[PDB]
Every structure is written in structure tokens, then in C-alpha cells.
Design a protein around this ligand. Structure first.
Ligand SMILES: CCOC1(c2ccc(-c3cc4c(N5CCN(C(=O)C6CC6)CC5)ccnn4c3)nc2)CCN(C(C)C)CC1
Length: 293
């Protein structure tokens, strides 16, 4: 019924996943993500998650409804953030210390919230995202972010030791894939493995953002991770060669060591990028560290 009352106004995004539209519902802007045929299973997983797990959180994209509307389409209706994604926003502006730390702390807060199981009737299972990237993190006008696109999410309950992986043909974006995914050594039956996959990807987003924080009048152009060492649309084997075989990691600009904030974020992101997954920081530790900077 939400879908029948929505007026679609403007397409604001298009990809292999489908399309995103700005719509109006009860006079308020809403985001309508219209899934492609190729990605119907992500719609299904996200719908199941939003209808069975209490997820609401400042830094998780707000859910309104899911619907199959009648031509038949699969729609996921959420709050609308006119700044669009971090990918979009980082390309039209540079950041200062305050706005950079607000972005990265808000992502760490949302990720910690996903990862941590909460006991009881007001609680939730532990959740790992598995495809975190700058294109599915939204920026609010108040400068905080929120994480979207839970179609690959996996859940875990420590009490019963049940791991719910989805059976989704989709895999994570290859440019952001962790070493253990690329060399197929990931322990697929351990929930902690998916959390560590998230932490790797977070480190890459951290790098993407920090580059855009000005210090002493200097800033880097926006670039996606590994822009300098793999082609656009890199293959799985392109990524395995660079990340696993050659052990490359995004370069830290020297100008960052003149700013205390960027020096601290540089230390943080390198501790997300250990080849050994169990050596990476946890989301909560990142959150704590960023609350102190
Ligand atoms: C008319 C263009 O306008 C700009 C723009 C771009 C996007 C949005 C926008 C996207 C979303 C959203 N999505 C659904 C959840 N996601 C995913 O699943 C990603 C695919 C994996 C993220 C996208 C949800 C909620 N809100 N939302 C707003 N809004 C505005 C594009 C560029 N311009 C420039 C020209 C100035 C500015 C804004």
C-alpha cells in the first residue's frame, strides 16, 4: 500500500542492481530502489531482514517498506538522503577535520551496531554486511552517514551458534574484496570471518574519505581503492594478484603525517588491512578509537 501511494519523481541512480528513484510519499521524499532481474535475491534477503530483525539505528538506512508492485517490480522503500552516497559526495567537496571524523565515526558506529549481538526482546542477532563500500553508505545533511544495502548480510546467534548465510548468487564488489575472499581461504563456516571481511572494506572506505580531508591547504583527488594498480572494472584475478600475491595496500600520503587526525586514521586503516584476518581491529575498537581522536 505504501508503493501505491508513492509518486515517482526522479531517477537518482542506475546500476547492475537496478535503479534508485526519488519519490514522494505523504508529501515527504522517499528512496525507492527498484531491483533488477539479476539481483532479486538481494531484495529478498533485505526484505526478510527488515521484517524480522530489529535493526533501527541512526547510522543504518531507515526502512519504510518492501513491496512487489503491479508489469511487476521489486521495491525497497527507505528514507531519502539528497546528498546521495559517500562516493557521490566525496567527489563534489573536500572535508575538514570535524566533517571527516563525523563521517568515519558514524560508519564505525553503524558497523559496530550490525556486528554486535544484543540479548533479549529489544535485541538483535549479530550481523555482517559483506559488501560495504562508498556507494552504499549515504551521507545525511547533518554530516553523519548511514549504511544501506543489506542484501548480502549474514546473521549469527551466539546462544545457539547458528550461522545464517544467504544463498545469493551476488558476491561482494571485487575491488573491495578481502585477501581471504580472493584466495578462497576464508573460513566460510565461521561468523567472525564475515566480520573481518567487513573490517577490511571499512579500512578501504576510511582511506577514500581521509584523502578528501584538507590539511595545510593540501588534499588528494577522490579515487577508489587500488585505482593506480588495477584497471577499471577489475577482475577477480586482477584483484587476487594485487592484494594477495603482491600484498599491495593503498598508499598513505606523506602530508597526512603533519596532521594528527590523519596520522591517527592512517594507523587505524592499516590495522584493518592485515592479510591475517584475526589480526584486524574490531568495529567497536575502531569506534572507541575514533571517539577519542
Ligand atoms: C539526481 C542525482 O543527484 C545525486 C543523488 C544520487 C543518489 C541519491 C540517493 C541514493 C539513495 C539511496 N540508494 C539506495 C541504497 N544504496 C545502494 O543500495 C547502493 C547501490 C548499492 C545507495 C543508493 C538510498 C537512500 N537515499 N538515496 C539518495 N540522491 C541524490 C547524484 C549527484 N548529484 C550531483 C550531480 C550534485 C547530487 C545527488
Amino acid at each position: 500500500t505504501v508503493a501505491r501511494d508513492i509518486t515517482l519523481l526522479e531517477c537518482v541512480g542506475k546500476g547492475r542492481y537496478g535503479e534508485v528513484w526519488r519519490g514522494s510519499w505523504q508529501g515527504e521524499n522517499v528512496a525507492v530502489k527498484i531491483f533488477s532481474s539479476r539481483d532479486e535475491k538481494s531484495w529478498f534477503r533485505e526484505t526478510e531482514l527488515y521484517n524480522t530483525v530489529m535493526l533501527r539505528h541512526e547510522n543504518i538506512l531507515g526502512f519504510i517498506a518492501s513491496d512487489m508492485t503491479s508489469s511487476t517490480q521489486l521495491w525497497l522503500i527507505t528514507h531519502y538522503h539528497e546528498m546521495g552516497s559517500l562516493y557521490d559526495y566525496l567527489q563534489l567537496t573536500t572535508l575538514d577535520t570535524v566533517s571527516c571524523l563525523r563521517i568515519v565515526l558514524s560508519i564505525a558506529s553503524g558497523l559496530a551496531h550490525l556486528h554486535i549481538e544484543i540479548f533479549g526482546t529489544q535485541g538483535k542477532p549479530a550481523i555482517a554486511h559483506r559488501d560495504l563500500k562508498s556507494k552504499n553508505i549515504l551521507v545525511k545533511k547533518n554530516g553523519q552517514c548511514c549504511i544501506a544495502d543489506l542484501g548480502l548480510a549474514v546473521m549469527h546467534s551466539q546462544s545457539t551458534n547458528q550461522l545464517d548465510v544467504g544463498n545469493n548468487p551476488r558476491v561482494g564488489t571485487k575491488r573491495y574484496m578481502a585477501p581471504e575472499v580472493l584466495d578462497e581461504t576464508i573460513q566460510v563456516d565461521c561468523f567472525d570471518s564475515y566480520k573481518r571481511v567487513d573490517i577490511w572494506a571499512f579500512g578501504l572506505v576510511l582511506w577514500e574519505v581521509a584523502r578528501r580531508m584538507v590539511s595545510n591547504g593540501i588534499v588528494e583527488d577522490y579515487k577508489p581503492p587500488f585505482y593506480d594498480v588495477v584497471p577499471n572494472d577489475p577482475s577477480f584475478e586482477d584483484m587476487r594478484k594485487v592484494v594477495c600475491v603482491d600484498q599491495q595496500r593503498p598508499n598513505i600520503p606523506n602530508r597526512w603525517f603533519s596532521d594528527p587526525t590523519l596520522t591517527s586514521l592512517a594507523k587505524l586503516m592499516k590495522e584493518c588491512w592485515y592479510q591475517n584476518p584475526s589480526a584486524r581491529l574490531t568495529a567497536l575498537r575502531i569506534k572507541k578509537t575514533l571517539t577519542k581522536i
